[PDB]
Structure formats: C-alpha cells, structure tokens
C-alpha cells in the first residue's frame, strides 16, 4: 500500500506495533538487503556506548539491513549516511539539524536523533532513532517541540527513506562523497571534550578523509579521533 | 510508524514493492498470527478457481495469517470474514458492494474484489485482492472508477485492517455471527447456474449453517453447493 519508489532501501518494510529493538531484530533475522524494520515503540531500545534509548510512541524507530561490503577502509562511514539522511529530512521540514560527531543530530544543541550502526561480517544494520511527536528526556528535543506542532510520522518516514536510498546508492559508487556532506552539516569550530581512555579538550576542526574527528589541543597538538568507544562533550 | 491500533490483525505488517504472491509468501514463511503481507504489485497473483489474478500497481493486494482453530468447520466462514470486511470498507467510502457466493464482491454486478483462503499447514492464510486505483479487466470495476477519483490506498488499508480485526475477534467468540452478516450482504433470490460436471440451474435462495449455497431447481429439488472448486454464473 506504501508505493515506495526507492531502489534498495525500502524494497521491503517490516512494521511492528511493538518490538524489543529494531536493531536486534535486524541483526538476528534472515533479511534481504534494503529491508527496513520499523516499530511504533521499542521496549528495549539501544543506544551507543551501551546506553538505553527511550522509544515511546510518536517517534521514528527503524533499522535498515545493508550489505555494502566496499573496501574495508571506507565502511565506517555508514553512520554518516544515517546522520546526513536525518539532517536532510529535518531541513525538508525546516528544522536546523546539525551533526554532533560521530552519530548524533542536534537542534540548538539538543539531541533530536541518534544513529547506531552494528555490523557482523557482510551484514550491516543501520539503526536510526528520531524524536518526532513523542515526549523526550532532558537533554533532548523533537520535531514537534521545534515546530510547535505535530508532524505526520509517515511523511517523515517517506522523506527519510527516500533520502537514505539516494545517499546509499551514491555511497556504493563514490564512498567519499558522504564526507563532504557531513562536513557541511557538522558542528565544528567549537571547543569539545573527548571522553575515552582518559580525556582531552580542544577545538573540533573538521573530519578527515577517513571520517576521523580532528582536534587541535591548546598546545597545538593535533589528535585524530577514531569512531569507537569514545564520546564527545560540548563545553 | 503506521500506528495501527488493532488487537491481532496488523500487529505486524510486511510490505513489498513487488512480490510473486502474498498468499504464497504467507504460506511458506513462519509468521505470527495477525501478520499482514501486502505488496504494491504481484507478478504471480492467483485466484480461487486456480486462475491468475491481475495485480497491477494501484490495487490493494494482501494476505493475513490466522490460526483461529475453532471447532474445525467454521472454515468457509473465514472467506466470509474477508468478503464482509471488504463490503464494510467499501461502505465507508460510499460504495455499495454485494457478495457473490462464495468469495467475490461486486458493485452493480461488476467485480471489485476477490477473496482466496488457503489453510495449508495449520495456519490459515486469508488473501484479499481489491481494485482501488489500478486498471481493471473488462467487466470489472474499481473504487476509483466507482467514485470517479483516486482513493488514498493507505486509507483503504487502514479501514480494511480495522474491520477485519473486529470481525475476526468476534468470530473467535461467536463464530455463527458472520453467517447472518453474509446473508444480509449477499446476492440472493436470483437465478444461477452451477458449471461443471452435473451442471444445473436454479434460484440461489440462501446459505446454510455450513456456508453452503442453497439452490432451488425448477423441479423443486433443493441442492446444497459446497464451497471449493465451484463456479457460479448469474442468469
Ligand atoms: O544516539 C545513539 O546512541 C544511537 C541511538 C539509536 C536508536 C535507534 S532506534 C532504532 C534502532 N533500534 C535500537 O534499539 N536502537 C536504534
Ligand atoms: O477472486 C478470486 O478468485 C480470489 C482472488 C484473490 C486475490 C488476492 S491478491 C492478495 C492474495 N495474493 C494472491 O496471490 N491472491 C490473493
């Protein structure tokens, strides 16, 4: 009934009134590339850094099965596909979404969406949680709160899937193109604190050709942060 | 993100841009009760009389997985649940559909929908094909042709799933109720011909408690037509 016109992402869509986690279902089940798993609510939503993700009714909670298997080097860029897709959709609704390296989208420094990519071999699961009309925790915001009015959840879904399909098809061809899009939509030029094995502060200058965050410490030392067990905090 | 509020039918929905047959997929895949399989188009759609069923873009092509298992002979009643559900949905859109025993819905004697039930395995698959905005064969009709305007396919889907869930939940408790609903919406009191071996003609009087079509031949003989391979023609 949906009439999706995408090439890969959205070939099939599995909808649930309720699910434990779309990412877990997608990782576990035998699914074709491009299949989207979406649920009205998640009872056990998962975030990055082993944090839980509140997923009440009203938000967009989905996961997409991908099997890019490009050069091992240009693979860790899948997270950016999700973040950029969300930013483009937000702009379509006139909301100023900006990317917080490596996987968050903020509006006025408040979290409106998060991306969780999980991969085991050939299969890559791209999870995206976007606050639309749902209530949110402190430190977060939603499309409804930003616009001051309810937004048709299905319209957001259609827009996002369309953007993601386009970004993904181009990523298979030109893997580095996404980096330019991230750079143009990422919060940079401000001081940040990097939390990992210890911590350090500096100016988030840009992302390099591998998607690493480039930080300039006050001493002038340049650090390159790799996506992984590391978090970013704005000062 | 569809936000369905049904109890059983529609707890999960699997959408396909293209599929061979929603009934075939439902039969050969492990799916929980209430799962709805829907596709924009079918490349190998089929009907009751082991015939082909045109399933172009624009129509509503779906299958529902059921596992009622009421006393075992309220089986032909499942087909009736599908037919009545369609009739109720059509009424919501200002269209008067009537049932042609045992699985077709006609509008002014032109076919607008067909129901195909298959109990293969121990699961029962309820398939429904409804002409909405798609081109239709000569002699048939569609919601678009009846209303003179395009009808939002998802609105039809939501309406039908809602009606079917209600009808099914009641069927599980009061299996006999569907019979009077069928009788009140079925084409009766007209002459028909039963094709095939031992063909005969008569007046279609009503359906009995087993869902059999009761025919009064001109001789006064009363025959009971069982639901299955049977082919009926209006005279
Ligand atoms: O910002 C983060 O830390 C990532 C959050 C990712 C949330 C989404 S909701 C859809 C998918 N299913 C999950 O359990 N998590 C992701
Ligand atoms: O009128 C008939 O003889 C029954 C037609 C049933 C058509 C539907 S379309 C959804 C489902 N998938 C199929 O292949 N057939 C049924």
Distance between Cα B197 and ligand 2 center (Å): 25
Mutate to test the pocket of ligand 2, among B18, B39, B50, B55 (most ligand atoms within 8 A of CB): B55
The H or E element containing residue A99 is strand A98-100
Torsion angle, alpha carbons of A176, A178, A181, A186, to 10: -100
Distance between Cα B23 and ligand 2 center (Å): 7
Instruction: Return the residue of A nearest to B160 by Cα.
Output: A1
R_g (Cα) of chain A, nearest Å: 17
Strand A60-66 with A36-39, pairing: antiparallel
User: What's the rounded Cα separation, in Å, for the pair B68 and B209?
Assistant: 18
SS3 A6: coil
User: What's the rounded Cα separation, in Å, for the pair B179 and B201?
Assistant: 24
| B15/A16 Cβ within 8 A | no
Yes or no: say if B60 and B38 are a contact pair by the CB < 8 Å rule.
Answer: yes
Q: Give residues with Cβ within 8 angstroms of A107, minimum separation 6.
A: A90, A95, A96, A97, A98, A141, A146
| B57/A3 Cβ within 8 A | yes
Nearest alpha carbon to residue B47 among B22, B25, B15, B75: B22
Name the burial class of residue B54, with classes exposed (0-12), middle (13-18) and buried (19+) by CB atoms within 10 angstroms of its CB: middle
Angle subtended by helix axes A153-173 and A78-92, to nearest 10: 140
Yes or no: say if A228 and A212 are a contact pair by the CB < 8 Å rule.
Answer: no
Can you list the domains of chain B with their CATH numbers? 2-187 (3.30.930.10), 188-235 (2.30.30.100)
Q: Where are the alpha helices (DSSP H) in chain A?
A: 22-28, 78-92, 143-147, 153-173, 177-185
Yes or no: say if A159 and A97 are a contact pair by the CB < 8 Å rule.
Answer: no
Among the partner residues A2, A40, A153, nearest to B15 by beta-carbon distance: A2
Name the burial class of residue B209, with classes exposed (0-12), middle (13-18) and buried (19+) by CB atoms within 10 angstroms of its CB: exposed
Nearest alpha carbon to residue A23 among A99, A103, A91: A103
Q: Give residues with Cβ within 8 angstroms of A172, minimum separation 6.
A: A68, A70
Distance between Cα B84 and ligand 2 center (Å): 15
Technique of determination: X-ray
Per DSSP, A31 falls in state -
Strand B110-118 with B104-107, pairing: antiparallel
Per DSSP, A226 falls in state P
Query: Between the CA of residue B191 and those of B41, B220, B226, what are the distances in Å?
Result: 36, 14, 17
Backbone angles phi, psi at A187, to 5 degrees: -75, 115
Q: What is chain B written as a DSSP string? A: ------SSTTSEEEEEEEES-HHHHHHHS---TT-EEEEEEESS-B-TTS-B--B-TTSEEEEEEE----STT--HHHHHHHHHHHHHHHHHTT---EEETTTEEEETTEEEEEEEEE--SSSEEEEEEE-SSS---TT---HHHHHTS---HHHHHHHHHHHHHHHHHHHHH-TTHHHHHHHHHB--SEEEEE-STT-EEEEEEEE-TT-PEEEE-TTS-EEEEPSSS--EEE-
Ligand closest to A55 (CA) is 1
Residues 87-126 of chain B whose Cβ lies under 8 A from any Cβ of chain A = none
Instruction: Return the residue of B nearest to A60 by Cα.
Output: B1
Nearest alpha carbon to residue A85 among A1, A9, A192: A9
User: Encoding tokens for residue B72?
Assistant: 């075992």
Distance between Cα A127 and ligand 1 center (Å): 5
Instruction: Return the residue of A nearest to B12 by Cα.
Output: A16
* Contacts with A17 from chain B: Cβ below 8 Å: 4, 6, 10-12
User: Encoding tokens for residue B89?
Assistant: 């949905």
With vertex at residue A223, the alpha carbon angle to CA A219 and CA A228, rounded to the nearest 5 degrees, is 145
Atom of ligand 2 nearest to the CA of B128: 8
User: What's the rounded Cα separation, in Å, for the pair A67 and B68?
Assistant: 38
User: What's the rounded Cα separation, in Å, for the pair B131 and B85?
Assistant: 14
Looking up tokens 């030392």, which residue turns up?
A: A221
B3 at interface of A, judged by CB pairs closer than 8 A? yes
User: What's the rounded Cα separation, in Å, for the pair A111 and A93?
Assistant: 17
**Resolution of this entry, Å:** 1.6
Query: Between the CA of residue A135 and those of A55, A96, A111, A112, B33, what are the distances in Å?
Result: 9, 19, 13, 11, 31
């Amino acid at each position: 009934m949906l009439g999706l016109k995408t090439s890969i992402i959205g070939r099939r869509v599995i909808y649930f009134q309720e699910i434990t986690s779309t990412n877990e279902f997608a990782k576990t089940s035998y699914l074709e590339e491009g299949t989207v798993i979406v649920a009205d609510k998640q009872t056990m939503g998962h975030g990055r850094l082993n944090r839980k993700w509140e997923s009440p009714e009203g938000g967009l909670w989905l996961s997409i099965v991908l099997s890019p298997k490009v050069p091992q080097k240009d693979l860790p860029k899948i997270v950016f596909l999700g973040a950029v897709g969300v930013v483009e959709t937000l702009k379509e609704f006139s909301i100023d979404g900006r990317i917080k390296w490596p996987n968050d989208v903020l509006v006025n420094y408040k979290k409106i969406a998060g991306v969780l990519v999980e991969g085991k071999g050939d299969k890559i699961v791209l999870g995206i949680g976007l606050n639309v009309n749902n209530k949110v925790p402190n430190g977060a915001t939603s499309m409804k709160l930003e616009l001051g009015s309810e937004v048709p959840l299905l319209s957001v879904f259609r827009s996002l899937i369309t953007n993601l399909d386009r970004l993904y098809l181009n990523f298979l061809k030109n893997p580095m193109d996404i980096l330019n899009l991230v750079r143009d939509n990422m919060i940079l030029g401000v001081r940040v604190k990097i939390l990992g094995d210890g911590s350090f502060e500096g100016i988030a200058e840009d992302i390099d050709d591998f998607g690493r965050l480039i930080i300039r410490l006050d001493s002038g030392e340049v650090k390159k942060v790799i996506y992984g067990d590391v978090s970013l905090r704005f000062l």
